């Protein structure tokens with residue numbers, strides 16, 4: 028899957044976690060967002076096509092995703108304990124990384 | 134070095150930044166710090182030895198460092214812009230991150 032597909036998989040699943048009632052739904056959604064994130068990371072965004080492999084940017088965007096996966100595990104750890112609400116909440120913090128990094132790379 | 138040294142390097146250098154009066158000292162300290170972090174991140178803390186690298190824990194431990202590294206980077210950039218005060222101020226935010234993950238794994 029490509030970046031356009033990765034982001035799409037992310038957006039959709041964060042939606043699902045909103046409409047989610049039971050724990051499981053929330054888990055399968057994150058499992059998916061964690062896969063997508065890592066993949067997205069292995070990619071090179073159109074605004075960085077020229078940027079060098081180790082450009083400070085390439086390191087920034089890189090780290091960004093590590094923060095996203097980090098926050099996904101946070102909510103994943105919770106969905107696992109069966110704690111919906113808490114995960115759903117912890118899942119919102121993700122919009123903050125989205126905005127912070129989109130602002131810089133979208 | 135071992136997790137005992139890396140942290141030594143962090144506690145040592147962090148304080149250096151507080152007593153420093155010019156950007157230069159700050160940047161050098163932060164640079165050393167950034168290293169130590171990436172290093173501590175690669176080791177397994179005693180309290181987590183018998184754990185699995187896929188364990189919820191290792192993920193949270195993994196993340197903490199990512200948070201810290203990002204913070205060292207945000208203060209490092211300010212120092213490269215000569216904001217000795219804004220830089221030190223940012224550095225302060227590191228403690229918050231330490232007290233938090235030390236509670237869980239120290």
Ligand code: HEM
Nearest residue numbers: 031034037038072073088091092095121124125128132133
């Ligand atoms: C889970 C939170 C996130 C959501 C819901 C999300 C959602 C989206 C959506 C809907 C798009 C538009 C895709 C299109 O129009 O084809 C997009 C694009 C993009 N996102 Fe995210 N995103 C998230 C997190 C991130 C993060 C953390 C990064 C960077 C570390 C990132 C980097 C990008 C980039 C570079 C694009 C533009 C792709 C292109 O130019 O085709 N996104 N994202």
Ligand code: HEM
Nearest residue numbers: 137140143144147178194197198201227230231234238239
């Ligand atoms: C840059 C802010 C930090 C400072 C100044 C700091 C400082 C220290 C100091 C002085 C020690 C005691 C070492 C010893 O007694 O030998 C220590 C231990 C430790 N720190 Fe940090 N630390 C920081 C951040 C972190 C973070 C983010 C983590 C999260 C993984 C962490 C995890 C640990 C652990 C697990 C130990 C115990 C080592 C042991 O006794 O085996 N520290 N830290």
Ligand SMILES: [Mg+2]
Nearest residue numbers: 028032033036
């Ligand atoms: Mg996908």
Ligand SMILES: [Mg+2]
Nearest residue numbers: 147148151152
């Ligand atoms: Mg004092």
Ligand SMILES: [Mg+2]
Nearest residue numbers: 203204206207
């Ligand atoms: Mg940053």
